[PDB]
């Protein structure tokens, strides 16, 4: 254990901001099931944590694309390296919940 | 945008390992509903990403506790600082899925 953490630090580090998060390829690309991806996930900068109030929601305000190298494989066939671009979050912000 | 990321880097950084992840307090403590926490979430080192095969699963092998400072606030009442301990993941590893 690292003892009791400082209050001001828990809020600053937890407040809705862009943090390193791994996203599943199968979750973003639902039309790619026959080609096993290696790796099956990719690291993307997304917004995570919580808001200041219960009636708010941590969501992104800006976006961007990032190309990556993925090895697509298929049973009883072969393998191959391809270029895949994913969407990331550039800016984060809290806003009142809708649905 | 930056450019096409290196393959060896996407796998080494995406492979099931301990990464900074924010956990919701309400998700861990389902009994504390009458006392709103500030912040409502806390940063904990958990395992995230994906495994080498589809039949595997990224899960932790070891654990630990971490104390933090949280401000409990109740409607029409007052506020107060308390010590809350959360569970984190020390070691991560991939194993065949069960359910």
């Amino acid at each position: 254990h690292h003892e009791v953490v400082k209050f001001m630090d828990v809020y600053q580090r937890s407040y809705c901001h862009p943090i390193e998060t791994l996203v599943d390829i199968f979750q973003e690309y639902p039309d790619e099931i026959e080609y096993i991806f290696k790796p099956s996930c990719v690291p993307l900068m997304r917004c995570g944590g919580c808001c200041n109030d219960e009636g708010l929601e941590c969501v992104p305000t800006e976006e961007s694309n990032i190309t990556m190298q993925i090895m697509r494989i298929k049973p009883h066939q072969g393998q191959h390296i391809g270029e895949m671009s994913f969407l990331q979050h550039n800016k984060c912000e809290c806003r009142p919940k809708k649905d | 945008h930056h450019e096409v990321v290196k393959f060896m880097d996407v796998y080494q950084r995406s492979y099931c390992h301990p990464i900074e992840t924010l956990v919701d307090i309400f998700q861990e403590y389902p009994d504390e509903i009458e006392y709103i926490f500030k912040p409502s979430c806390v940063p904990l080192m958990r395992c995230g990403g994906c495994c080498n095969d589809e039949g595997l699963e990224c899960v932790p092998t070891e654990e630990s506790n971490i104390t933090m400072q949280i401000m409990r606030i109740k409607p029409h009442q007052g506020q107060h600082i308390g010590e809350m301990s959360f569970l984190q993941h020390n070691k991560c590893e991939c194993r065949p899925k069960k359910d």
């Binding site: 809020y11 600053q12 808001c51 200041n52 809290c94 | -």
Partner: peptide, 19 residues
Amino acid sequence: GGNECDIARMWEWECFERL
């Protein structure tokens, strides 16, 4: 210094005291 405590902004100490 007055009352510029935005709900969707870094609630400093003063804002926390008067939430």
